[PDB]
């Protein structure tokens, strides 16, 4: 199956995915001297009021929550996007160490965490069809820093060791993902791909300039949990993030400065 090890990891991809050597391959290093500045850009649109989020789970390569996207819930909008996108999950990519694990970097600045909160566009009608489309998924990634706790991410953090391996679900109701932004919604921008298998190259990406801060004891709890199902050799689920690809003939644009 694919995985993050050696044997099964991203540079083995390519194989299954050949678009894994495509044109429009996510994360990339942001060069944020090489930035351009996009003064005709919007102020994202983060509208998260009535989420419903609903399940979290192992799926062997992060854990994601799910939310219920039958409606207009939980939408992005705004910023380089046109249309209205609708959240249906959010997860995270990580590191063994703090000085690794997000999945963009800054200037070659590797983060200790990665949250994505994909959104699917509303006139693909369904996340499936979405992400078979160019314009069909918008991302927005949000860098982890270790220091001070972020209290909006306990509830998630307290709930894994009910799901640690793969496999494993549980109901997470009522999650509001408000608590897991920063303050500033200044971002950079530019077109790209899912970072895992299937690699399509669907996605809108919005990656915020400002991290949050996360504990020490938040991040170690991401690193208790295991990549194999109950049974199989232990593996922790660590180093579950794709490094840059070539940016190609990609410009990447800031809302900011
Ligand atoms: N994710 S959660 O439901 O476990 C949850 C939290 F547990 C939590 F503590 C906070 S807070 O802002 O740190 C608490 C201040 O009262 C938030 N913060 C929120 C929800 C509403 C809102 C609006 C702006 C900024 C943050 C938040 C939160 F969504
Ligand atoms: N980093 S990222 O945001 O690119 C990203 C993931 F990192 C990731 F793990 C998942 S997954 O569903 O958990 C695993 C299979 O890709 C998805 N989900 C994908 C798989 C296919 C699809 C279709 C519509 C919306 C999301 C996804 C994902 F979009
Ligand atoms: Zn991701």
């Known amino acids: 199956?694919?995985?993050?090890?050696?044997?099964?990891?991203?540079?083995?991809?390519?194989k299954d995915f050949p678009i894994a050597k495509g044109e429009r391959q996510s994360?990339?290093?942001i060069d944020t001297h090489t930035a351009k500045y996009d003064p005709s850009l919007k102020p994202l649109s983060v509208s998260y009021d009535q989420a419903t989020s609903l399940r979290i789970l192992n799926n062997g390569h992060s854990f994601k929550v799910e939310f219920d996207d039958s409606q207009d819930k939980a939408v992005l909008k705004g910023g380089?996007?046109?249309?209205?996108?609708?959240?249906?999950?959010?997860?995270?990519?990580?590191?063994?160490?703090?000085?690794?694990?997000?999945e963009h970097t800054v200037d070659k600045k590797k983060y200790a965490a990665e949250l994505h909160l994909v959104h699917w566009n509303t006139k693909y009608g369904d996340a499936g069809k979405a992400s078979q489309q160019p314009d069909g998924?918008?991302?927005?990634?949000?860098?982890?820093?270790?220091?001070?706790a972020k209290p909006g991410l306990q509830k998630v953090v307290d709930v894994l060791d009910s799901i640690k391996t793969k496999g494993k679900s549980a109901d997470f109701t009522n999650f509001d993902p408000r608590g897991l932004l920063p303050?500033?919604?200044?971002?950079?921008?530019?077109?790209?791909?899912?970072t895992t298998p299937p690699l399509n190259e669907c996605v809108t990406?919005?990656?915020?300039?400002?991290?949050?801060?996360?504990?020490?004891?938040?991040?170690?709890?991401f690193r208790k949990l295991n990549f194999?199902?109950?049974?199989?050799?232990?593996?922790?689920?660590?180093?579950?993030?794709?490094?840059?690809?070539?940016?190609?003939?990609?410009?990447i644009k800031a809302s900011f400065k």
Do not use: C
């Open 228 to 251: 194999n199902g109950e049974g199989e050799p232990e593996e922790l689920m660590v180093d579950n993030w794709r490094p840059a690809q070539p940016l190609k003939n990609r410009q």
């Open 137 to 148: 998924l918008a991302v927005l990634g949000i860098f982890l820093k270790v220091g001070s």
């Open 183 to 194: 303050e500033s919604l200044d971002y950079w921008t530019y077109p790209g791909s899912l």
């Open 1 to 14: 199956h694919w995985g993050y090890g050696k044997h099964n990891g991203p540079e083995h991809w390519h």
């Open 80 to 102: 380089p996007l046109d249309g209205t996108y609708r959240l249906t999950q959010f997860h995270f990519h990580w590191g063994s160490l703090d000085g690794q694990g997000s």
């Open 205 to 221: 990406w919005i990656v915020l300039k400002e991290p949050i801060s996360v504990s020490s004891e938040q991040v170690l709890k």
């Open 27 to 29: 994360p990339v290093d």
